[PDB]
Scaffold this active site. Structure first.
Site, PDB file in Angstrom:
ATOM      1  NE  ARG A   7      -0.934   8.938  -4.091  1.00 29.01           N
ATOM      2  CZ  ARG A   7      -0.040   7.969  -4.086  1.00 29.01           C
ATOM      3  NH1 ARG A   7       0.225   7.249  -5.181  1.00 29.01           N
ATOM      4  NH2 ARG A   7       0.860   7.884  -3.090  1.00 29.01           N
ATOM      5  CB  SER A  61      -3.028   3.560  -7.696  1.00 29.66           C
ATOM      6  OG  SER A  61      -3.937   3.201  -6.658  1.00 29.66           O
ATOM      7  CD  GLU A 110      -8.389  -5.060  -3.076  1.00 34.23           C
ATOM      8  OE1 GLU A 110      -8.829  -5.938  -3.866  1.00 34.23           O
ATOM      9  OE2 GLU A 110      -8.260  -5.321  -1.860  1.00 34.23           O
ATOM     10  CD  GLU A 112      -5.923   0.008  -6.883  1.00 33.52           C
ATOM     11  OE1 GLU A 112      -4.790   0.526  -6.700  1.00 33.52           O
ATOM     12  OE2 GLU A 112      -6.688  -0.301  -5.975  1.00 33.52           O
TER      13      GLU A 112
END
Lengths: 192, 103, 45, 103, 103, 103, 103
Positions: A7, A61, A110, A112
């Site tokens: 992150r 996330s 993406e 996540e």
């Protein structure tokens, strides 16, 4: 297992310790039971991104691989030469957004993984330092990081997440499989 | 006064200071009568003891032998990481005389 | 309606609370680990 | 001096190590007269004790037992992985006489 | 010897078993003369007491009551789930005799 | 009574106050008879000890010496954050006589 | 007996109940001769003390003070929420008599 997540956060490591870890938006100390945010994955999943990788509606996330997590932040948090990339042990408060929403995932590609409530400092294994965009490969190990414990845990079976999904009350999913057998009360339901 | 472990240790003799620079792999705690020790083991496979509060100890020491066995068990349970360990080489397993922790 | 939107939260909060109990328990138990040991026989003789 | 829970336990009789490379399932602490105990339970239905003192013990024991009752509690809370465990099988429940915590 | 708290609790007459299967809601500790005890509460209502080490006690107990007020609190900060309460019901509030904590 | 470490340090005649506002860099503890103490340092470069008890230590502060050795360890581990110390300047390393913790 | 900090306290002439629902802002501790206490603060001013063992204190009260400085320290690191304190206010700083932690 010994899986780590990523992150790209700007907030300093010093302000994280202070914070108790990485928080969603509007949480300051990790232990407020009475300091409630909206806890929603659906909404979470589809927030737009002003100057932060998605950290709204009660989740924070992560990215499953670095390059990725770094691509995603120097795309965002660009404007800052400085930022950190936190390495994050895997725990059962982590939802695979995709494995939760399935069809209804606002951004598959993406991919996540999301921590409901945020990531406690103990979770944060350490971090990278992001200077002049270009990553600095030197690792800042984390006291507070429990290895016996964390190398023993993994992410929560998606089905834990079916009840939490958060589709609007009259959304299709609530009456489809798998949601239909997990759907909170007054959620889509049996009837309509 | 020893203003550090390195000094401290050499104050004595029958000793030797080991820079372990690592967290503790294992911990054994005995209760066996005439066997009342703590035993620390390292990845490198380095064994250590906290002497059965044995007759060769100054009353003051008696209280020390116990606290130690306590620093061990919470450094372990907390994956704390020892720096060095001053130890007596005259025993097998080389008894622990003192501990440091940094970083 | 209200129930569903509400219900998710009842649920989300509930989930967050139990997890907080394992973290605290593990971080909290550990600190008190051998502190709570100095607490015992030195403390009752 | 014994070098690990294995050679340790071996000096004593009516013993046997037990591998477990597990953690604790139950913790039970009594205070009731005749019963100042702790009973340990493993997920595979295994039961063990920490006995009430002296009768067969030594005074050097009495503080040990007090460290044991200690250890387990935060062996439990923490979540353990009591590697192996020495024990007086000549007992019932079988009396814990040593413990080994393994990464 | 019991292998569980339930077998222990009926060996005493004037006891009672309480499955609470939950975490303590609040904890009070007193040091105000004669009122040196601990006080525990459950979400559901239940208040329980570790009694003032009076004369209802044998000497063996005194130091098992200090371990017991320690256990509540450790379990109170920790948030563990108490599953069972062995208690003397002939007092008010009820009086803790034993505690069960399985994961 | 004094409501500070400052006014509290003030009560003595060979003491000084220390505004560190940092966390203990290291922590050492010897159990070695004639040296059962503890030294702790700061990254700034600072050193301090927890004196090996007596003759000048009234019987009362023995229990206090011990408290604070437990306070020094748990602050190290838990990641501290000590505000100031109250040290005696008669010694090098200055001895600790009190501490503040601000979070 | 008493079943809450209110009732408990209300049982004395010179005590008051402070309601805080807050966490300890600073933790002061002394080993110093004469002053071997502990001071606890609050952000919206509360200052309290854990008195030194004396006359006014029996035998029962002496352990209790010792096991109350154990409980402030960790209430502090643990970051705990302090509910209500029952203070003996014929003093300055008020001395703690009772603590109740809730949430």
């Amino acid at each position: 297992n010994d899986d780590k997540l990523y992150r790209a956060d700007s907030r300093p490591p010093d302000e994280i310790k202070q914070s108790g870890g990485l928080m969603p938006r509007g949480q300051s100390e990790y232990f407020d039971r009475g300091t409630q945010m909206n806890i929603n994955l659906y909404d979470h999943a589809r927030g737009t991104q002003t100057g932060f990788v998605r950290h709204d509606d009660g989740y924070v996330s992560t990215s499953i691989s670095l390059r990725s997590a770094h691509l995603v932040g120097q795309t965002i948090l660009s404007g800052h030469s400085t930022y950190y990339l936190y390495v994050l042990a895997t725990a059962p408060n982590m939802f695979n957004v995709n494995d939760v929403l399935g069809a209804y995932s606002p951004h598959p590609d993406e991919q996540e993984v999301s921590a409901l409530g945020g990531i406690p400092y103990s979770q944060i294994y350490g971090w990278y330092r992001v200077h002049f965009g270009v990553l600095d490969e030197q690792l800042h190990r984390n006291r507070g990081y429990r290895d016996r414990y964390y190398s023993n845990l993994d992410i929560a079976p998606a089905a834990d997440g079916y009840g939490l999904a958060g589709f609007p009350p009259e959304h299709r999913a609530w009456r489809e499989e798998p949601w239909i057998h997990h759907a909170p009360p007054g959620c889509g339901n049996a009837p309509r | 006064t020893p203003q550090n472990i390195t000094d401290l240790c050499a104050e004595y003799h029958n000793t030797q200071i080991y820079t372990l620079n690592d967290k503790i792999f294992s911990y054994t705690e005995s209760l066996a009568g005439k066997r009342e020790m703590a035993i620390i083991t390292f990845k490198n496979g380095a064994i250590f003891q906290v002497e059965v509060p044995s007759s060769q100890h100054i009353d003051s020491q008696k209280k020390a032998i116990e606290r130690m066995k306590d620093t061990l068990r919470i450094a372990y349970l907390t994956e704390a990481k020892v720096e060095k360990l001053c130890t007596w080489n005259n025993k097998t397993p080389h008894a622990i005389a003192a501990i440091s922790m940094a970083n | 309606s209200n129930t569903c939107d509400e219900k998710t939260q009842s649920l989300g909060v509930k989930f967050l609370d139990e997890y907080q109990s394992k973290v605290k328990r593990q971080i909290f138990s550990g600190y008190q680990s051998d502190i709570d040991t100095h607490n015992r026989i030195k403390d009752e003789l």
